[PDB]
Structure 1
Amino acid sequence: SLTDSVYERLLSERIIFLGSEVNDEIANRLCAQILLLAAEDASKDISLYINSPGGSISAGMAIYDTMVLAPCDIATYAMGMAASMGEFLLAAGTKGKRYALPHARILMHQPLGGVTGSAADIAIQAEQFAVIKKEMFRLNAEFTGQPIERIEADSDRDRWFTAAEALEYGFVDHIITR
């Protein structure tokens, strides 16, 4: 393809894209790309440009674990939109290497889901939703450097950030302007 050819040539320059909703297909693609790029050069940075409306928690936790366990530093770039799991994986970049493009918008909000089934199933899902939401807030508190009480308060409904507000809040480390 053309779009796959431009992405392959930027994969050669160690630039990968989270450019859609973080589902398992895009996550396993990025996890494969981070494993492929950490196998080629384990010392050069991987540039993850994030134009993402968010996505699955477990799909983005696959990416986040592959970002952390890569010996490369994952430079993340908020490009237009880093919402939900996009803001998570943005803030999950290497400290000092989390960038916002100056008109990127950052959406931190608590996870979406759905309960279904019997009341014993839903009691397990909500027990697990409390586990997922506590760990998602713990990591956003670890990434941004904010308290987990402030992360839980701000990420109660949609909490939008500009690039300057995300720099103050702690999702990104720099706003690049070249």
Structure 2
Amino acid sequence: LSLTDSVYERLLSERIIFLGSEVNDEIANRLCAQILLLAAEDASKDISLYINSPGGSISAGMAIYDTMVLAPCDIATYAMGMAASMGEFLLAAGTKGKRYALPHARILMHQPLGGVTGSAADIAIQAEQFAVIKKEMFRLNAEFTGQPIERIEADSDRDRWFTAAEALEYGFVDHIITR
């Protein structure tokens, strides 16, 4: 029980959870367990998720996303420091009206990455699945932000960088915290 874990447990006792690294499978499993446990303890209070993440896998992000949506409580997502790639997806996935960006946070939107490795017959399947995943990613981003899927597709072709105010205008977040 190191200092980091001690403080994190203390915060978890106050329904605050963190996402501060790549979205691996381990990080997603930890976050999903935290959300399930918090929901079991109480299904009426909110859960705050702080996002300082440079991105990562899509399967892990989707595990976290489904666990967030299915939880009876409301997940309020605060973008602190950086919300890139999958972190952006999870930030914009928070309960509508409960998505915040700290004033100097930055957000990054771009299309996924991957690799093709096997033979031609396997690369065909990989490419098909890439198309499916990209289409679904853009669909969900457009749903979250309210922008047309065409605009999301055009903007994500390469790294698109947003500040807090630009993100608020776009639709990633509903507020900029200041106090």
Give TM-score scaled by structure 1 length.
0.99
Residue segments in structure 2 that go unaligned for 5+ positions in a row: none
Question: How far does the alpha carbon of each residue in 1:112-168 deviate from its partner, in whole angstroms, 9 at most, with x for none?
Answer: 111110111111111000010001100000110111100100011000100001000
2:173 equivalent to 1:172: yes
Q: Percent identity?
A: 100
Distance in 1, Cα, partners of 2:151 & 2:27: 30
Partner-residue secondary structure (3-state), 2:108: strand
Distance in 1, Cα, partners of 2:28 & 2:55: 12
Distance in 1, Cα, partners of 2:6 & 2:135: 40
Partner-residue secondary structure (3-state), 1:117: coil
Partner-residue secondary structure (3-state), 2:50: strand
Distance in 1, Cα, partners of 2:158 & 2:125: 23
Give TM-score scaled by structure 2 length.
0.98
Aligned Cα RMSD in Å?
A: 0.5
Distance in 2, Cα, partners of 1:84 & 1:19: 13
Matches within 5 A, 1:1-178: 1-178=2-179
Distance in 2, Cα, partners of 1:120 & 1:8: 48
Distance in 1, Cα, partners of 2:12 & 2:150: 38
Distance in 2, Cα, partners of 1:137 & 1:11: 32
Distance in 1, Cα, partners of 2:172 & 2:155: 13
Distance in 1, Cα, partners of 2:143 & 2:52: 22
Give structure 1 regions of 4+ aligned residues with deviation exceeding 2 angstroms.
none
